[PDB]
Paper text:
LCs were distributed in two groups: a set of eight amyloidogenic LCs responsible for severe cardiac involvement and symptoms in patients (hereafter, H LC), and a set of five non amyloidogenic LCs isolated from patients affected by multiple myeloma for which no amyloid aggregation or proteotoxicity was observed in patients (hereafter, M LC). Five H LCs (H3, H6, H7, H9 and H10) and two M LCs (M7 and M8) were successfully crystallized and their 3D-structures solved. The crystal structures were all refined to satisfactory refinement parameters; in all cases the LCs were dimeric, with an overall quaternary arrangement closely matching that of the previously reported LC dimers. VL and CL domains display very different structural properties in the seven crystal structures. CL domains (res 115–214) are typically characterized by high quality electron density, are all very well superposable, and the dimeric CL–CL arrangement is clearly conserved in all the analysed structures (root mean square deviations -r.m.s.d.- generally fall below 1.0 Å over the entire CL–CL dimer - Table S3A and Fig. 4B-bottom).
The linker regions connecting VL and CL domains (residues 110–115) allow evident variability in the mutual orientation of VL and CL domains, which is described by the elbow angles spanning from 107.99° (H7) to 157.36° (M8). In H6 and M8 dimers all six CDRs (three for each LC monomer) are traceable in the electron density; in H9 and H10 five out of six are traceable, in H7 three, and in H3 and M7 only two CRDs are traceable. In some cases (H6, H9, H10) CDR3 (residues 89–97) participates in the interface; both CDR3s in the H7 dimer lack electron density, while in M7 and M8 CDR3 residues are located far from the VL–VL interface. Despite these fine differences, all the structures here presented, except for M8, display an overall conserved VL–VL quaternary assembly and association interface. Only the VL–VL interface in M8 is markedly different, one VL domain being rotated and resulting in an asymmetric VL–VL interface. As for the other structures, in one VL domain of M8 strands 3, 4, 7 and 8 participate to the dimeric interface, while only strands 1 and 8 of the facing/rotated VL domain provide association contacts. In particular, M8 LC, which is the most stable LC against temperature, displays the smallest dimer interface area with the lowest calculated free energy change for quaternary assembly, compared to all other considered LCs. At the protein concentration required for Near-UV experiments four LCs (H10, M2, M8, M10) precipitated before the unfolding process was complete, thus Tmapp could not be determined.
Author numbering:
A (entry chain B): 2 to 213
B (entry chain A): 1 to 213
The structure:
């Protein structure tokens, strides 16, 4: 069973952050064999900590590790922009078996937090004339680069047919993403409205669209 | 702190060949002819595939082969089959009585054919126009691999100002999706006769056109 980590955390340059990683008494709690890895996208992982608290040669002392019960912790002090990466824990579940955490993305805040602009598009006429009814929810100009998207039909949940893209930085150094909802024309015309609800930093924006 | 470095995961198509790498040091992989390879399916006991770099036990298919060069060892799986989907681990002697193991590689077996993108061009929405904005969205979906080139036109003429295109991301069907949006004022939108989104993917081109109404 995988080890449990928070999906993300953020801090300002110079701050201290802490990442926790929770397992069971058969792995994290059974041995002092917890290791921490830093991975930038596309690069091989770098070992930061091994055996709970030991640093390999050449690893900065800004990184420290500890453990209490079935939870191991990685602390990063003096947060620097180069520390923006994915961090995952690893632990022995036995002599040869290892279990891995799900990874925590560390965001180093390089600009003010920005709530997203949300623009919802009904199906185009070309689309409906072709018996398609895809809706697109454009989400732009937000920071940091994480949002939660939920669709609705007449104020009821809709989970099937939804695809949301991973946020990516645009030219204004803010993040953009889109979510689209594949619908048949019958679904589109049988409801009074469809809604795209976008949540960012606990704040929620909902846009609504209706057949015409 | 020692471990043999393996890529976390690779993937290949049925029938093709893949090669896993296993990087050690001059004191283990590079020092001896004693690299082994194991295959493990979830919840099952590991199976020795290769020992002493390239020797194959009886009962192991000859589709598995091992080699090494310098401080890096390699396992090759020819004629990839669905049953080959598993975790693969390398190990090497670090000395007479010591051994180092690898971090493991998940081998996923999945057909991933090329696919040209579906392109849907959206004109400005009503609420957007009443807020004095007229963004156009070009939805680009269901393509593989994850690289496209988007070009916008107005009146058949190239337009690069005010366009943003998201980095393509893999969707639930293992194909990629992205969107390109063009930021206009309502006045710009109405002052043109035509707007077009042209998507290029592997020597294939799709152009969609929309006009104000
Ligand atoms: Na113009
Ligand atoms: Na045009």
């Amino acid at each position: 069973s995988a080890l449990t980590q928070p999906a993300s955390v953020s801090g300002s340059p110079g701050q201290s952050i802490t990442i926790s990683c929770t397992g069971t008494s058969s792995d994290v709690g059974a041995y002092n064999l917890v290791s921490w890895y830093q991975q930038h996208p596309g690069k091989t992982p770098k070992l930061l900590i091994y055996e709970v608290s030991k640093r390999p040669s050449g690893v900065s002392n800004r990184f420290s590790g500890s453990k209490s019960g079935n939870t191991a912790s990685l602390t990063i002090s003096g947060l620097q922009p180069e520390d923006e990466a994915d961090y995952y824990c690893c632990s022995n579940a036995g002599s040869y078996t290892h279990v891995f955490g799900t990874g925590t993305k560390v965001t180093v805040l390089v600009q003010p937090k920005a709530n997203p602009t949300v623009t919802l598009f009904p199906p185009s006429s070309e689309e409906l004339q072709a018996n398609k009814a895809t809706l697109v929810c454009l989400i732009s100009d937000f920071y940091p680069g994480a949002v939660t998207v939920a669709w609705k039909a007449d104020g009821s949940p809709v989970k099937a047919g939804v695809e949301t893209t991973k946020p990516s930085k645009q030219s204004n150094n803010k993040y953009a993403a889109s979510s689209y909802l594949s619908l048949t024309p019958e679904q589109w015309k049988s409801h009074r409205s469809y809604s795209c609800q976008v949540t960012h930093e606990g704040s929620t924006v909902e846009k609504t669209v209706a057949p015409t």
